[PDB]
Amino acid sequence: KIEEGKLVIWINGDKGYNGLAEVGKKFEKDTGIKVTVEHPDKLEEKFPQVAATGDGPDIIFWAHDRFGGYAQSGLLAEITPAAAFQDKLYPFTWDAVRYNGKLIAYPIAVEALSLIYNKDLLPNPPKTWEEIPALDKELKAKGKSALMFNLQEPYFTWPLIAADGGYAFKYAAGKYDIKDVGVDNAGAKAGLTFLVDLIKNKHMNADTDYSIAEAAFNKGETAMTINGPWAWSNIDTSAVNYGVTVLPTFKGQPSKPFVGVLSAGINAASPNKELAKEFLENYLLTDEGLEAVNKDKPLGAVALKSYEEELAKDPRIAATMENAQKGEIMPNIPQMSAFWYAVRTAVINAASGRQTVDAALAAAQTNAAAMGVCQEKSKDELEDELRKMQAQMKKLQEQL
Amino acid sequence: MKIEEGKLVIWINGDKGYNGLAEVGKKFEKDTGIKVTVEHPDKLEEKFPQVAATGDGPDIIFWAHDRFGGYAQSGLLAEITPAAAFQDKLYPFTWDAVRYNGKLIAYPIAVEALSLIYNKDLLPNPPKTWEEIPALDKELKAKGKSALMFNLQEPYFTWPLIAADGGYAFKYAAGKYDIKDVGVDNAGAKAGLTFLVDLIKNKHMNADTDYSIAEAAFNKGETAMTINGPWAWSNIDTSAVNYGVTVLPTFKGQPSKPFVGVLSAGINAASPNKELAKEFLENYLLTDEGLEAVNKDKPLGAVALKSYEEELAKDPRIAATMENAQKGEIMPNIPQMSAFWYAVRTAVINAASGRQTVDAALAAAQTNAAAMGVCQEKSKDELEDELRKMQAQMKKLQEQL
Amino acid sequence: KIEEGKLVIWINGDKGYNGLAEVGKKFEKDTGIKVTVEHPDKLEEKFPQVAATGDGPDIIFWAHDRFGGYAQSGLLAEITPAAAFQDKLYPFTWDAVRYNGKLIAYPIAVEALSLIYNKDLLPNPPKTWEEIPALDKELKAKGKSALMFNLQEPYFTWPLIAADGGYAFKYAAGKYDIKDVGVDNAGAKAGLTFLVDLIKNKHMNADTDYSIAEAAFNKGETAMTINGPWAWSNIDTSAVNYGVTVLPTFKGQPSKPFVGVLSAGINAASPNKELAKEFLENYLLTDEGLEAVNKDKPLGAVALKSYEEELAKDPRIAATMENAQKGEIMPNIPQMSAFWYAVRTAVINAASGRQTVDAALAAAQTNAAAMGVCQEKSKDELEDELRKMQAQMKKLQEQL
Ligand SMILES: OC[C@H]1O[C@H](O[C@H]2[C@H](O)[C@@H](O)[C@@H](O)O[C@@H]2CO)[C@H](O)[C@@H](O)[C@@H]1O
Ligand SMILES: OC[C@H]1O[C@H](O[C@H]2[C@H](O)[C@@H](O)[C@@H](O)O[C@@H]2CO)[C@H](O)[C@@H](O)[C@@H]1O
Ligand SMILES: OC[C@H]1O[C@H](O[C@H]2[C@H](O)[C@@H](O)[C@@H](O)O[C@@H]2CO)[C@H](O)[C@@H](O)[C@@H]1O
């Protein structure tokens, strides 16, 4: 059950949810309809579970890559923007939320990873990944490190993997070929090998996550990090004088980050579809709406032409757009769940030394494609559950 | 039941005329000295493949033809080789229903299709459309009655509504089924199931209603209509209800499309009595006298035997049965039908009970019906069930300390 | 994990590991590099688990059928022999270790099963399988038996199954069709049915394994066995006067043994790749090298042309090559593991009487052409683990 006459919206905890809530306050002030903004953990996984039961938020925010899966699973309502409203947003952002001929979400903003560097610590950032090892050695002598970024989410290491030729699904003849996966070719192998070598050579730690990497950079312990626009706000609050720039090259090739369009989908089971449309079209996707969210945590290059004309003047947004141009807009196909899970497992296993880069990537190629009932994620969850049950069994055998 | 030589053990579903079939068995025993045992175990369609795979089970198994391609593919059925003269006694289309990869793998017995069964005293003019059923129920509720009750636990009964406006199992093209093209989640399938769920949401039907409850309600004059096959008419006759058998209601102006079954008799690949089974089936069951004995117990539908069917076809209930069959389709017999049926069974039950939305339930069913295999939906369900049970046992055990 | 400046080699326990170590000793005297030969149990399964973690031997020996799987999994280095060396080996043996255009191992020897018979007990061996039951009935009256061979490994029963039409994967239109499996056709079924009838009629025991059959033949208790060239050494040391000959026919058709090419692969994670190449090319694959291995346990028909010209004069080798010519060289494709596991399970289940031949083979056809993550083997392991956990629960409930 979803309460009628109210809007519940879910958005990730790294985004400007407090700003989104202000927009909700304006909506409530004009209409009397309460808006509740929440940022639950494991959002992208939680939504498909509750939505399938007819429960969950009225509106779900995530990058566009998950939306095809949601739509295929019967979880999203088709959105019906009139022509005039569709002209307010960039066409390519609409393309990102089109699934099987139908618009399945409202595009909000374009996200791409950039290299973020400490200006005082490193006035001239490296153009290549190759020179990072020597840079780190010099900084260790000063009690610092070259680079820390999230190694637990494949999103962040993907630009290096794609740099020299790695790809997700081959786009051929108007479609993605789910039988043609590129996570195990020579370029992908070379990219991940470099990451793993950085860790082998004590220039990076395999255990480093989002939180640890952010804290190290914002406290001035590391000279560089890799992140998107949402992260700039916390860096501002800290004392670090930072620049946002083009990602380093690898083997002479640009890093190719996967570009995301933060998007707003409407729960198929919502009894407030028309309120959701009004909130999204008449309140959020306006100059005042996006500004409020942006002021909280920066959105990137927004989908709304009128407000983007302002943000484009920002050099950090230019760097963001340069990096996006060098990458590719993510597919939204249902198979993106398997791809992301496969690559997540490979990077983590290779980085920790449990699998070689080659073994890990060969397995990722297999898992990214395809099947359904017994996916890699499912087998892993089962094996974890069995281990947990075994543990309980031993503690019970002990008390017997 | 490690299949004794020199005896016949027969399995048939409990809704069928097993007592009548036993009379045929008795006649067989008097002529040949070979004892025939007819049994009707619960869940036989699932029990047969399990026990037959070990060389156990009945010599002869009765079920609608849709399960038989799977049985045959799994190596459980003997190939049937009737002489030309015998094969000519049965309609060719009924033989098509039991032909798998060029081989006959059962004897066809009878054609089954669902019809709308209505109480003439309670409802002299039955509804032509599903759409007018809510208002009909509203009138009948005021008299302490209801419009319609039928088995909502078996997707067989709900499939006619789902298929009405465009739902399908596997796409038929160029002479074969494309098992990668499943149609349980298109606009028509979704519209049909949504209508059913809306019937439940608006309290015109109850999600818990099963076969025995719907039958009792109709035969007691408590509900104006039910949906059932010919095997059901016998108990209605016995109840004395003034009933008619008629065309299913339309949905969105389109006929309901029941999946039609051909009741069939297969021979266990492991039976050491294959010749006795053949003789029983050809020279005893598939005669005018044989089928009549079964039919007198529970009606078979339109039988496969030409000579006996020319007599039955004159019955208006059989004409209605054939009209509904023509509006539906004879089921595929391909191995993938068990996955299809299980997928739809889960979807209908989950949506009717409110556990899943109609759209989520059918989208997963579309996925599950096309599951290549080794890890099927059913196996996944059984695994999850087994784990929760073990978790439950541990919770009770930790509690005891 | 893998020591640099040293070589560790793994080879199966039935092969001439002592003889290979002698080659290892010769390598060490000339180069100063220590060579360690090991024969761990369950080598074919143990290698991919340890190699995937960057551990294991530098060199792995096994028949070529598993190598495509090892290579697909990213466990094998491409070998770089160069033209002149390749000319020393038969072209068809190079074909056996070529995977997706690359050489992924060095071929060593061609192995095929033969009929091995006691000349004193049975001076004229049966030409057909059909005449074996009557032979056993005659021999049992003398306190002996006609035939015992390993019934636990599908390798040994495969020749009978393939005789009348059974096949693994159809080689059609230039490639193996993993969707066209032939273990459930009329020929496969007729072949397995005959085997099961032998057992039902007490001419054989379903539990008979490699060790039991070998001991039975070498103690003069059974008149015939089925084995490869490796087994002759132990027979020589026994008192049995034996002959090696063409396998019996079935329904007028030759038995079709699956032919293996014993091969040496190089662990992708090895830091001694150059040492391994020099070892394999300049020490093992020479006349003295192979002869040293051969004297310990016979290799069969070797891949090195110069030494085979010698071995070919041996009538036992002529028999081996006659049977090999009547069979087919195994595919090396990754799918061969599902195939072997599928068939292993079918033969055992049918032979034991737990399933009918038709049910077991029909299920094998399905398993051999599996998907990806949920293989038959995984399911079996899952079921095994559940049964154990269930047993523990009953044992705890028993304690009250
Ligand atoms: O790491 C895999 C993950 O990458 C992307 O998620 C991003 C998201 O797009 C950003 O807005 C930000 O929150 O970082 C996330 C990574 O932690 C994909 O959108 C997501 O589907 C995928 O699983
Ligand atoms: O509900 C799924 C079920 O439908 C059919 O079973 C019918 C059967 O054909 C009729 O003779 C009668 O007994 O009712 C059954 C439904 O309860 C399919 O034949 C069967 O395979 C399928 O599971
Ligand atoms: O039995 C299945 C098994 O057969 C082959 O293994 C052979 C091997 O090739 C021989 O060299 C010798 O050691 O006997 C083995 C049988 O026990 C296949 O090569 C192997 O992949 C397969 O599992």
Residue numbers in the entry:
A (entry chain B), C (entry chain C): 1 to 400
B (entry chain A): 0 to 400
Copy out sentences from the published article reporting this entry, exactly as the authors wrote them.
Mcm10 is a non-enzymatic protein that aids assembly and activation of the replisome and coordinates helicase and polymerase activities during elongation. Mcm10 interacts with single- (ss) and double-stranded (ds) DNA, is loaded onto chromatin in early S-phase, and is essential for helicase activation and the subsequent recruitment of replisome proteins, including RPA and pol α. An N-terminal coiled-coil (CC) domain (NTD) has been implicated in Mcm10 self-association and the interaction with Mec3, a subunit of the 9-1-1 clamp (Alver and Bielinsky, unpublished results). We show that the CC region is necessary and sufficient to explain Mcm10-Mcm10 interaction, and is capable of forming both dimers and trimers in solution.
